[PDB]
Write a protein that binds this ligand. Sequence first.
Ligand SMILES: Nc1[nH]c(=O)nc2c1ncn2[C@H]1C[C@H](O)[C@@H](COP(=O)(O)OP(=O)(O)OP(=O)(O)O)O1
Ligand code: NA
Length: 153
Amino acid sequence: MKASRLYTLVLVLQPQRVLLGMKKRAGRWNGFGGKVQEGETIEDGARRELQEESGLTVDALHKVGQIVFEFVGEPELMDVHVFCTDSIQGTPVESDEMRPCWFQLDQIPFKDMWPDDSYWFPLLLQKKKFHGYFKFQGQDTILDYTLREVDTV
Ligand SMILES: Nc1[nH]c(=O)nc2c1ncn2[C@H]1C[C@H](O)[C@@H](COP(=O)(O)OP(=O)(O)OP(=O)(O)O)O1
Ligand code: NA
């Protein structure tokens, strides 16, 4: 088995809309997140990345899933811990690398999201927790994947 590097992903999910960020420098909408750093808990890394990437603060997050990504030709797995929150402080801010935008929950922009999101984001919307794994060739093609609803993440 490959080694894995820890990442976070945060979805700001309100009753009628979700906040996503478009990668500016590519072209896909995603939640907010990045690499966990030395000495911080995963949840604190998720809060930090949300603040660094979007400007938003939150005192707490709910863990909703974990997804492992494998890319053909890359030596490490990405171990992505997925969090949600419904409660925000501040306005999202555009940066040189990210443009935030709200989407109504009948307009989730799946075609401009990573392909895996079509599989797990419906579970998130149903208040379900999940574990996933996806093996990609490049940015567009899934060669293998597993997904399971779990009671505890
Ligand atoms: N297939 C996929 N589907 C998805 O929904 N999110 C993915 C994904 N693959 C990666 N992600 C998420 C995980 C993480 O939040 C983000 C990728 O992290 P980044 O590359 O932004 O890390 P960092 O920006 O911290 O690294 P540096 O650029 O070195 O600072 O995208
Ligand atoms: Na990031």
